[PDB]
Amino acid sequence: SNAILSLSYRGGRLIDSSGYGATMNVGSDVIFNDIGNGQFKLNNSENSNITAHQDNFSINFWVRTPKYNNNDIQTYLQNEYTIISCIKNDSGWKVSIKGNRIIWTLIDVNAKSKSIFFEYSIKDNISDYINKWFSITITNDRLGNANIYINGSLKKSEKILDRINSSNDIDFKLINCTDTTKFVWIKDFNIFGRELNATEVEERYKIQSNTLKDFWGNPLRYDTQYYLFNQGMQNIYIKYFSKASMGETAPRTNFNNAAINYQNLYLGLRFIIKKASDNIVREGDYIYLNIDNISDESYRVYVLVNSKEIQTQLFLAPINDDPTFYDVLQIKKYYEKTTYNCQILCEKDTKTFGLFGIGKFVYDNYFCISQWYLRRISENINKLRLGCNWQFIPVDEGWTELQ
């Protein structure tokens, strides 16, 4: 139904947008930003805290938690710490994190507890969860079922048990975390006074998602260094091929040990998005793609305008005024609009050159532009043809790499 409580960071202050007038107490070691409305970071200190002073309800919020430290994996796996709690006389509810698990716990007046959790892999080459914003929704009823939804989709649902106390305070704070460097990002925290159904959860997800985002789920920005990720070919990156003035694919390198495995992200061409015509890139903007790690001089992505082929290799070159090439691009989000993917179009202007992708040429796979990606092969084509879907990866503190 209607939010009992909703945290928003409006104009320098954390408030309750609920209209229920919750009063907020904020420690001195909390970091805020005004992205969306907005975001806060809990560090591992007693001074990094927020208190909201206020059998069927729902909890919804998005969370961003940092990648494990390769050399501190047993701490990551074994240390469960509370992040959000509503407890009184040892009874109530808490949200906790234990490594790659997010955990919901109900505790009765006798200290008898039962938990439900969501676990994501820490062995996949590419993760939709590690260090990335993702939405969680927990519902609970009197039947009684507890459900965990992740990114709008039901992931778990279990029963069931004495009485569970209700508290006037909700504490946002790391409890029992043993890594002094730990932090957690939270946004869009909401409480509902009823059990939201599967349809209600999906819709609130789509709503809480026109904004172009980066790989981590934050707004995409101009003048920011980004590595490039391809949704259709996730296990390669784009590398400058000196002999040809092109981008060729290369296999991502990886790291693995006994407990974990991942492919490296900070590889290949490093791009900067420039305004062609604030610093947030919006759907449909006209942009250039600069590349700043090929040499001392700036390079840029060019489209061969006088090609009659279906697909053409993109020309990665020093800045020039050669009219046989064109550098004005448009970043778009044609579909899968809740994801962090985007497409790159070039048009000039009654003439469409296609979308950026990866194509087979005389053979190897090259960073290219192709009309193939605009073909309306079938109504579901966009679910099958993923090579024109890209994400931009900035270096982020929650994801560190060797070398």
From Swiss-Prot:
Region spans: N-terminus of receptor binding domain (N-RBD): 2-195
C-terminus of receptor binding domain (C-RBD): region residues: 210-401
Top-level division of the source organism's lineage: Bacteria
Organism: Clostridium botulinum
Membrane topology listed for this record: Multi-pass membrane protein
Lineage, top ranks: Bacteria, Bacillati, Bacillota, Clostridia, Eubacteriales
Part of the intact protein present: 867 to 1297 of 1297
Role noted for this protein: Responsible for host cell targeting and translocation of light chain (LC) into host cytosol. Composed of 3 subdomains; the translocation domain (TD), and N-terminus and C-terminus of the receptor-binding domain (N-RBD, C-RBD). The RBD is responsible for the adherence of the toxin to the cell surface. It simultaneously recognizes 2 coreceptors; polysialated gangliosides and the receptor proteins SYT1 and SYT2 in close proximity on host synaptic vesicles.
Location of the motif Host ganglioside-binding motif: 370-373
The record's note on its domains: Has 3 functional domains. The translocation domain (TD) which probably forms membrane channels to allow light chain (LC) into the host cytosol. The C-terminal receptor-binding domain (RBD) has 2 further subdomains, N-RBD (Hcn) and C-RBD (Hcc). The N-terminus of the TD wraps an extended belt around the perimeter of the LC, protecting Zn(2+) in the active site and may be a pseudosubstrate inhibitor which serves as an intramolecular chaperone for the LC prior to its translocation into the host cytosol. The RBD binds transiently exposed coreceptors on the host presynaptic cell membrane.
Subcellular location: Secreted; Host synapse, Host presynaptic cell membrane; Host cytoplasmic vesicle, Host secretory vesicle, Host synaptic vesicle membrane
Stated name of the protein: Botulinum neurotoxin G heavy chain
Site (Ganglioside-binding site): 372
